[PDB]
Ligand binder design. Structure first.
Ligand SMILES: Cc1cc(C)n2c(Br)c(CSc3nc4ccccc4[nH]3)nc2n1
Ligand SMILES: [Mg+2]
Ligand SMILES: [Zn+2]
Length: 319
């Protein structure tokens, strides 16, 4: 925490970090510092007490598990995408939203066990008893509130009780929105609002939907990196999915192909299906609403053409 307070971002990165395609991968020692940097530039140096923010960040890190994908790296990656959207669309948002959203993104997968909502609900895990829908996401929000209530961690203590209640609702809605089950309906409504010219960012119901799609766009942003980085991250995603598949075999339940390591051949077509059904529509709608986010769409389209290249047998060396 102390070290973090003395972190300065190297000047070469100060330019690169503002770009959507920025990959945090090669800077692991600087991830906590990169988050403080992004909060300071977007929100401001006075949004949070520096000691409480650093204490908060280090507890958030401790409370992500050593799972192949839903880990600390993912949290900082999703926060960086949100940083880039906010910097590109700064004055469409309030200080409270900028605060809420950077924090929501860092916390949105807190205490992830590497198990899907399907697993927990099929195996009637206690979390699924509590949280009937959006099971892990309700848990991630609960974990965020637990961390905020730690001694020295309440980064929102400069707020009124009203504003505290407001920022918790921004965060609740933002984390819940990362349930991909909710994405399909959210994007369909946004697409209709946009095509019919009814979308109004000063309409709070519209604004909540736009924020939800920003949360999907940031959660999925590995598909917006340069091909080699996207391809490396896909390996982590499958490491985790296949471990769930293995855990189901043990328990006498057979898994869906995506979670079955003995169906690895179906990955390229699986990705094609994921890009067509989820990622391309997501970034397509976000770019309509927030034209500065276009680079995410262009990058997503580039990676789709790369998966097509893999499918027709034309890819290059792996390492
Ligand atoms: C960044 C990201 C996020 C999500 C949610 N991803 C998913 Br889901 C996938 C995998 S799509 C897929 N379908 C398959 C069918 C059979 C075998 C393998 C398959 N992979 N990638 C994601 N990336
Ligand atoms: Mg999640
Ligand atoms: Zn996530």
């Amino acid at each position: 925490w102390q070290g973090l307070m003395q972190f300065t971002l190297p000047v070469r990165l100060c330019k690169e970090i503002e770009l959507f395609h920025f990959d945090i991968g090669p800077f692991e020692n600087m991830w906590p510092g990169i988050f403080v940097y992004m909060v300071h530039r977007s929100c401001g140096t006075s949004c949070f007490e520096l000691e409480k923010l650093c204490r908060f960040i280090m507890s958030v890190k401790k409370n992500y598990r050593r799972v192949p994908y839903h880990n600390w790296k993912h949290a900082v990656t999703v926060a960086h995408c949100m940083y880039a959207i906010l910097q590109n669309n700064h004055t469409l948002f309030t200080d409270l939203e900028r605060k809420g959203l950077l924090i929501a993104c860092l916390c949105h997968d807190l205490d992830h066990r590497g198990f899907s909502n399907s697993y927990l609900q099929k195996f009637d895990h206690p979390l699924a008893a509590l949280y009937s829908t959006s099971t892990m996401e309700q848990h991630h929000f609960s974990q965020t509130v637990s961390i905020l209530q730690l001694e020295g961690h309440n980064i929102f203590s400069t707020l009124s009780s009203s504003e505290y209640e407001q920022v918790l609702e921004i965060i609740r809605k933002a984390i819940i929105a990362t349930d991909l089950a909710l994405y399909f309906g959210n994007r369909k409504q946004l697409e209709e609002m946009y095509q019919t010219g009814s979308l109004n960012l000063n309409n709070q119901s519209h604004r909540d939907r736009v924020i939800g799609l920003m949360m999907t766009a940031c959660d999925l942003c590995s598909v917006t990196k340069l091909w080699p980085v996207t391809k490396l991250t896909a390996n982590d995603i499958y490491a985790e999915f296949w471990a769930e598949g293995d855990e189901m075999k043990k328990l006498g339940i057979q898994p869906i192909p995506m979670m079955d390591r003995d169906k690895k051949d179906e990955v390229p077509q699986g990705q094609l299906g994921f890009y067509n059904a989820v990622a391309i529509p997501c970034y397509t709608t976000l770019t309509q609403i927030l034209p500065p986010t276009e680079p995410l769409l262009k990058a997503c389209r580039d990676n789709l053409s790369q998966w097509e290249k893999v499918i027709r047998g034309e890819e290059t060396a792996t390492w």
